[PDB]
Design a protein around this ligand. Structure first.
Ligand SMILES: *[C@H](O)[C@H](C[C@@H]1CCNC1=O)NC(=O)[C@H](CC1CC1)NC(=O)OCc1cccc(F)c1
Ligand SMILES: *[C@H](O)[C@H](C[C@@H]1CCNC1=O)NC(=O)[C@H](CC1CC1)NC(=O)OCc1cccc(F)c1
Lengths: 306, 306
C-alpha cells in the first residue's frame, strides 16, 4: 500500500529530447520521425521578446540558422515552418528512437508527467495537473522551454504539453504540440493574468477514496448530502461544480470502497467548513487535487507500461 | 522558478528491469552485466514466508527453477547464489543496456528515486527519503518487490535500494544491492517495529531556503538562535539534532540567500512552536523534509544527466 505522486517512466521521452539553438538562444526540441518541435521564441532576442512580430522574425531566418543537436550529434535542417506557437524543423534523419506517439490536447483537471530538460538533456520528472485556469505549477528555469508533458498508455506516448513561459504569479504556461496555448496566453514578455483558479473537486474526491483504500478513514463522517447542496459549498470555496458525469466517473471507486459518492461529498464538505484540526490525510495537511480517478485506480492496482 | 518533488529520469534503470519467477512467485529483478539481482523471498511459498529457513529453501532449488524474463525474451540461468537477502542469478547474456553503475549504501536522510515495477515492467517513478529509522514511505503493492531506488550522477546510476516488504504501519523496508537490510529488519512475515522516526532537520532547513529562493518569505522572522538552543526545541519535536557539519552543508544556500543558518533555525523554531496559522510554504501546509541541500541546489540551478 501507500500513495505517492508518481510520474510516468520517462525513458521513451528521453530518447526524443534534442537541443535547438538559434542565434544566442538555446532550448529543447522534441525529435519525432524527421521533425523537431520547439517553441518559436527560440528565434527572438531579449529585445524581440517584449513584442515579437513572429512572422517578420522567422522570415529573416534560414534552415542553416537552426542548430539542432541530439546528444553530441546534431541534425541537418532541411525545412522549417511555423505552426501557431511552435516551430517544426524538418531534419535529415528520422529519430531511430521515435516511440509510438500521439499529440493530445488535454482537458483541465487531467494530469501528465513533465520531463524537465536543459540543453537537450533530462533534469528530472514530476507529475502535475492542468489547472482549471490552464496553468501548471511546475519547476522551470531559463533553458527549460521545449520540455514536454506526456502520458503513457502501455506503449503509446501521448504528448500534451510544451513549456513556454512563466507567469507573474510563478505558475507556468505552455502549448499543445500543435502550438496552441492552453489558456488565454500569448508568447510575449508582458504581464498576463491567469484566471481565478479553482480546485478540481472530482480529483479531491478521488484522493479521499485513495485515502480510504489506504486505511486513512478518520475524516469519514456520519452525514450525507445532495449534489446541489454540495455545490453550494463548493462555490463558496472555489471548487469546480460536481456533476453526475463526475459521480459516474467515481463510480468504480465508490463501489470498491462501499462509500456513496454523496456520502464522501458530505465528508469533504465538513473538511472544507471545519479544516483538518491539525490532522493529515495520506501525509498531506491540504486537500490534494492533482490525482484523477484514473490516477488513483492505476496506482492502487499496479498498472504498467514498458 | 517553482519547486517540485522531482524524480530522476528513469530510462537507464528501465533498461535493467526483468521479471523473475520461481515456483508460483513472480517479482522484479535487476539485470546488469550477466547478473540478475532479486529478493531471495522469490523462493518462498506463502507458508514458507512465516519463518523461512532460506538456506534450506534455496538448497532445494536449481538454476532451471528460476524463470528470468526480459520483456518477452527471458535468459538462461547458469548460476545462482545467495548474498545476504538477495539472490544473484548468473545468466547466459550480458544486458546490452547495462549503464555505468555503482552499488551504494545510502545514509539516513539522503534521497533517491524509486521506479515501481510489476512483472518486470515500469509503473511509475517517485522521489523519496531514507527515513532516520531506515524505512521509506513508498507506494508498493504485491509484485513490486525487486523494484529499485537509485540516484544518477551525470551518466552513472548509483543503485541504493531494493524493495522487500511492508511494515505494519504501512511504511516500506528493503536492502541495498548487496542484500543487507536498511534498519533492523528481516525478510519474514512477522510484526516488526521501526523505531521512532525523526524529522530530517537539515533537509527542512534546505527546503525553507528553497522557499526563500522561490520568493516565499513570510515565515522569515526577526529572531536568531544558537545551535544548542535550537536543538533543545528540535528534540521536543523529534527533529534530528543540528551540527556544524550540517551548518557547513547549508553554507552555500545560506550565502546565496544572505540568511544566516542560525537565523533560519530561529524561523524554523517559531514554526515548530506556533504552527503555520493556516499558511502554506511552497504549496505545503507541513514542514517538508524529503529534500537534501544537494537536491535544492540541483533543482534551482538546472542540473542535467542524459
Ligand atoms: C524558456 O525557456 C523560458 C522559460 C521560463 C524562464 C523562467 N521560468 C520559465 O518557465 N520562457 C521565457 O523566458 C518567456 C519568453 C517566451 C514568452 C516568449 N518569458 C517569461 O517567461 O517571462 C516571465 C515573465 C513573468 C512576469 C512578467 C513578464 F513580462 C514576463
Ligand atoms: C513483494 O513484492 C512484497 C511487497 C509488499 C507487498 C505489499 N506491500 C509491499 O511492499 N513483499 C512481501 O510480501 C513480504 C514478504 C517478504 C518478507 C518476506 N511480506 C510483507 O510485506 O508482509 C507485510 C506485513 C505487514 C505486517 C505484519 C506482517 F507479518 C507482514
Amino acid at each position: 500500500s501507500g500513495f505517492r505522486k508518481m510520474a510516468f517512466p520517462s525513458g521513451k521521452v528521453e530518447g526524443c529530447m534534442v537541443q535547438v539553438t538559434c542565434g544566442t538562444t538555446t532550448l529543447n526540441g522534441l525529435w519525432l520521425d524527421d521533425v523537431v518541435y520547439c517553441p518559436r521564441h527560440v528565434i527572438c532576442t531579449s529585445e524581440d521578446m517584449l513584442n515579437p512580430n513572429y512572422e517578420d522574425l522567422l522570415i529573416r531566418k534560414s534552415n542553416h540558422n537552426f542548430l539542432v543537436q541530439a546528444g553530441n550529434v546534431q541534425l541537418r535542417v532541411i525545412g522549417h515552418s511555423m505552426q501557431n506557437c511552435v516551430l517544426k524543423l524538418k531534419v535529415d534523419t528520422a529519430n531511430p528512437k521515435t516511440p509510438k506517439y500521439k499529440f493530445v490536447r488535454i482537458q483541465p483537471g487531467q494530469t501528465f508527467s513533465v520531463l524537465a530538460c536543459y540543453n537537450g538533456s533530462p533534469s528530472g520528472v514530476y507529475q502535475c495537473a492542468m489547472r482549471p485556469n490552464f496553468t501548471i505549477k511546475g519547476s522551470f528555469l531559463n533553458g527549460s522551454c521545449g520540455s514536454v508533458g506526456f502520458n503513457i498508455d502501455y506503449d503509446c506516448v501521448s504528448f500534451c504539453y510544451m513549456h513556454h513561459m512563466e507567469l507573474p504569479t510563478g505558475v507556468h504556461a505552455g502549448t499543445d504540440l500543435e502550438g496552441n496555448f492552453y489558456g488565454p496566453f500569448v508568447d510575449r514578455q508582458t504581464a498576463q493574468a491567469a484566471g481565478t483558479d479553482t480546485t478540481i473537486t472530482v480529483n479531491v474526491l478521488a484522493w479521499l477514496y485513495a485515502a480510504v483504500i489506504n486505511g486513512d478513514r478518520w475524516f469519514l463522517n456520519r452525514f450525507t448530502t445532495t449534489l446541489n447542496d454540495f455545490n453550494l459549498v463548493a462555490m463558496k470555496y472555489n471548487y469546480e461544480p460536481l456533476t453526475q458525469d463526475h459521480v459516474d466517473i467515481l463510480g468504480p471507486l465508490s463501489a470498491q470502497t462501499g462509500i456513496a459518492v454523496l456520502d464522501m461529498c458530505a465528508s469533504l464538505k465538513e473538511l472544507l467548513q471545519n479544516g483538518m484540526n491539525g490532522r493529515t490525510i495520506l501525509g498531506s495537511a491540504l486537500l490534494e487535487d492533482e490525482f484523477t480517478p484514473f490516477d488513483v485506480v492505476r496506482q492502487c492496482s499496479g498498472v504498467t507500461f514498458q
